[PDB]
Amino acid sequence: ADYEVVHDTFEVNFDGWCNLGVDTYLTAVENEGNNGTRGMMVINRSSASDGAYSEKGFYLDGGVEYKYSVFVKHNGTGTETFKLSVSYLDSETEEENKEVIATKDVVAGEWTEISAKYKAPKTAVNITLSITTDSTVDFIFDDVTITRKAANAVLKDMYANYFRVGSVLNSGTVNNSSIKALILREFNSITCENEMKPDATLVQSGSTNTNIRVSLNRAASILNFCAQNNIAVRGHTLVWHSQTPQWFFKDNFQDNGNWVSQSVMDQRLESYIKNMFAEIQRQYPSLNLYAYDVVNAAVSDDANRTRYYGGAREPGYGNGRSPWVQIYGDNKFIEKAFTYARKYAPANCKLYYNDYNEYWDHKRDCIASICANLYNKGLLDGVGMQSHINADMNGFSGIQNYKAALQKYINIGCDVQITELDISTENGKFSLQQQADKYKAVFQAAVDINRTSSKGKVTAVCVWGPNDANTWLGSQNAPLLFNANNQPKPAYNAVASIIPQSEWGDGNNPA
Ligand SMILES: O[C@@H]1[C@@H](O)[C@H](O[C@@H]2CO[C@@H](O[C@@H]3CO[C@@H](O)[C@H](O)[C@H]3O)[C@H](O)[C@H]2O)OC[C@H]1O
């Protein structure tokens, strides 16, 4: 050993550590860790395989030998056998491996180090450490140690006096060293691509109408990285017709059950929102959760629905239909969601209504009407403009339409965030300079709002992915600021030229 890449001392957060086993419970407790410091208790284990795990792919590379060390303690009777296991996904064979790397006998009531050296295959990713015993005993652990032998020309700094500049992390991108360096260098906001959606956070087993179980396990390594590096997080998303398990809307908590009543759904909705915010605060209190998309994409693209049905999607599940409309009949669930979120959200977490095609007249007018109403009721802080646009200065998402919409939302009096900006080349139909021109147009439009008007502000501009190898549109649409090799594109240098150097600030402390 020689160089330390991880040291988890649960002094503030849960440090990326997660319950292994659906009913296992983790709780970090002052004074009860190692050397009288804060430690992680693991309780309610009901078999030997239950315990705790942490995905360390942000820190650990395949092919490198690491010394893993953990201090453990139990308060059972006699000796307990602790085990450290390392698991990983082999990125070539697509196959997972798991191995006990250390076994250690631990007497009751004594802090004991368990450690071993382990080198994963060079193709290993998602390197994950876990701690169990050969029993169901409660334990405490601490000091997870893993060892090995004004103002810069970066987006966050350039825009420091204007807005946060954000990107997106997901379960795969966590492991990419190059992406990690990129995020640390350029971006002061992160949204989880999928890991905070209801289907990633809802826990079916043991959920009841008034106590919906949630888990941050899918998002833990991202929240932990952001909290540790002073990167603010936008929560995404509390309510959406998509990526939400069908069972959440059914009487027996099964996909195949009967649709619940509105009053049962109100309980489940409030419980989910309440427990999401409670868990974020419990596990990652030092995280700057600066925004949350409370309701996502509830307005129909169909002009007939915006005209005659208050913008409600068609009721149902899948094909763009809404299980929320299925239960509530109506977009009435939107105000309910904001009401609950307002009750449970931290004071500094700004509440957003988030939507795409938000510059399309019929849809834009409907979005603006919903948000104006929520805003004036004190329930909403801003409109999220998803900005899934193409590289054309003209047309459907052209600069004229885009600015009209930006201005119209700003004119409500609320703030705006550009939340999921990507700029499709449409399979090579558009040039990279055309793309650069759209990016610059969008960033300039937001800068103009902030220098003008003033009342409402653009408080974040976020792109939906880090580079072209990691976009939900497919790489053939080459939609982002960095290419597949993580090199800056013409769009990056165009966006990097909008703010004069005299105006750059501390991106880690934006205005
Ligand atoms: O098969 C599943 C995929 O379809 C899923 O892809 C994600 C779908 O959501 C994408 O983000 C949304 C883009 O549209 C906006 O309206 C929403 O606000 C966004 O959440 C995300 O980028 C894709 O990765 O991934 C999970 C798979 O199981």
Task: Give the residue, by CA position, lying nearest to ligand 1 atom 10.
Answer: 472
Q: What Cα–Cα distance (Å) separates residue 167 from each residue in 24, 184, 195?
A: 33, 11, 14
Q: Do domains 1-150 and 151-511 have the same CATH topology?
A: no
Both tokens assigned to 103:
């076994």
Contact 426, 473 (CB under 8 A): no
Task: Give the residue, by CA position, lying nearest to ligand 1 atom 22.
Answer: 472
Can you name the CATH fold of 151-511? TIM Barrel (3.20.20)
CA 307/CA 289 separation, integer angstroms? 36
Both tokens assigned to 174:
């966590």
DSSP-derived secondary structure letter, 60: -
Describe the crossing of helices 399-410 and 361-376 by its angle, rounded to 10 degrees: 20
Helices (H) and strands (E) in the chain, counts: 12, 22
End-to-end CA distance of the chain: 42
| 316 CA from centroid of ligand 1 (Å) | 19
Domain positions in the chain are 1-150, 151-511
Contact 260, 250 (CB under 8 A): yes
The resolution, in angstroms to one decimal, equals: 1.9
CA 460/CA 318 separation, integer angstroms? 31
Q: How many CB atoms lie within 10 A of CB 407?
A: 16
* CB neighbour list of residue 382: distance below 8 Å, 6 or more residues apart: 291, 350, 351, 352, 353, 409, 414, 415, 416, 417, 456, 459
* Solved with: X-ray
Mutate to test the pocket of ligand 1, among 192, 193, 218 (most ligand atoms within 8 A of CB): 193
Please give the class, per CATH, of domain 1-150. Answer: mainly beta
298 lines ligand 1 (CB under 6 A): no
